[PDB]
Amino acid sequence: LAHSKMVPIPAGVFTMGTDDPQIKQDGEAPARRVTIDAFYMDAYEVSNTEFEKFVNSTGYLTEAEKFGDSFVFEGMLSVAAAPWWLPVKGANWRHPEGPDSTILHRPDHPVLHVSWNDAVAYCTWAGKRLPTEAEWEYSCRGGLHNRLFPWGNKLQPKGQHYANIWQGEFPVTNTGEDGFQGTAPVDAFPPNGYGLYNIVGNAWEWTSDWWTVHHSVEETLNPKGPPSGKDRVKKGGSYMCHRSYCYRYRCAARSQNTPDSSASNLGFRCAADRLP
Ligand SMILES: *[C@@H]1O[C@H](CO)[C@@H](O[C@@H]2O[C@H](CO)[C@@H](O)[C@H](O)[C@H]2NC(C)=O)[C@H](O)[C@H]1NC(C)=O
Ligand SMILES: [Ca+2]
Ligand SMILES: [Ca+2]
Ligand SMILES: [Cl-]
Numbered sequence: 001l002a003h004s005k006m007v008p009i010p011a012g013v014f015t016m017g018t019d020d021p022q023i024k025q026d027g028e029a030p031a032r033r034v035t036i037d038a039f040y041m042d043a044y045e046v047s048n049t050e051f052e053k054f055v056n057s058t059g060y061l062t063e064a065e066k067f068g069d070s071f072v073f074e075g076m077l078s079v080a081a082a083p084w085w086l087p088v089k090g091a092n093w094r095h096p097e098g099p100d101s102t103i104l105h106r107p108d109h110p111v112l113h114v115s116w117n118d119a120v121a122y123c124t125w126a127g128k129r130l131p132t133e134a135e136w137e138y139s140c141r142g143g144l145h146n147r148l149f150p151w152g153n154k155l156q157p158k159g160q161h162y163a164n165i166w167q168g169e170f171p172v173t174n175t176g177e178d179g180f181q182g183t184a185p186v187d188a189f190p191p192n193g194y195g196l197y198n199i200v201g202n203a204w205e206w207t208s209d210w211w212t213v214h215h216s217v218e219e220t221l222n223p224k225g226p227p228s229g230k231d232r233v234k235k236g237g238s239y240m241c242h243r244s245y246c247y248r249y250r251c252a253a254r255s256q257n258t259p260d261s262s263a264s265n266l267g268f269r270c271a272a273d274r275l276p
Contacts, residue, residue: 027213116259127276140251142192150192163201203267231256
């Protein structure tokens with residue numbers, strides 16, 4: 001396993017956002033042309049094993065461990081956003097559903113219950129950083145223009161599952177049709193054109209930017225988002241998403257959380273300007 005490998009993301013110009021927003025309240029619009037300098041992006045979400053190497057090196061205690069709780073989706077059980085999100089005492093990256101759960105059987109799955117601060121700590125320890133939202137989105141799009149997904153516009157191209165999201169009736173029944181009810185290994189499913197895995201679906205992914213929904217149509221170069229805010233931007237959707245209630249497994253989709261937030265469907269990957 002080379003689950004910390006990076007890929008070179010080529011320099012280019014791309015259309016960020018969409019003039020056909022699917023969740024208008026999220027500021028998916030307007031479409032805008034963005035220039036991105038060549039950089040490196042992690043091929044994989046950061047895994048449990050990779051995060052454990054960081055904790056072993058540094059002794060880092062995550063925010064969820066210090067607070068003593070984290071959000072867990074009710075459907076995984078053996079001050080919430082929805083009735084299916086429960087603050088669970090003792091839920092954290094080593095104990096993803098609570099104190100009696102474990103990561104021993106899922107070392108290669110994405111690390112969960114990591115806050116934005118935890119993610120920055122990891123990436124910086126690794127000689128990396130979080131990607132900006134624009135870098136993330138450019139990378140997600142995998143060299144295609146104005147597509148819904150990393151691979152195109154069909155959810156199941158050639159009848160194949162291309163990402164780990166929900167099938168069935170959310171939140172009561174996840175059929176596991178795509179092979180995974182919860183997370184999948186970080187190297188599951190096909191890569192996109194740049195070499196990236198699970199950039200939509202599996203775990204949500206933190207980015208560096210402060211959240212706003214007010215964007216200019218002006219062309220920009222390596223944008224970093226607004227200089228201030230209260231929530232940081234997360235991208236890509238998770239194993240929970242479904243067209244019926246949370247259609248956020250699109251590269252243009254976007255959501256947010258306070259930087260000290262953590263949950264059972266939220267992880268990250270790193271980026272870098274040059275190879276560490
Ligand atoms: C994190 O550190 C732990 C603790 O030292 C490592 O787990 C140990 O690994 C060795 C070698 O396989 C075993 O002999 C020890 O008994 C393990 N400790 C116990 C009791 O769990 C672990 O491999 C490190 N994690 C990573 C991802 O490198
Ligand atoms: Ca699934
Ligand atoms: Ca993901
Ligand atoms: Cl789009």
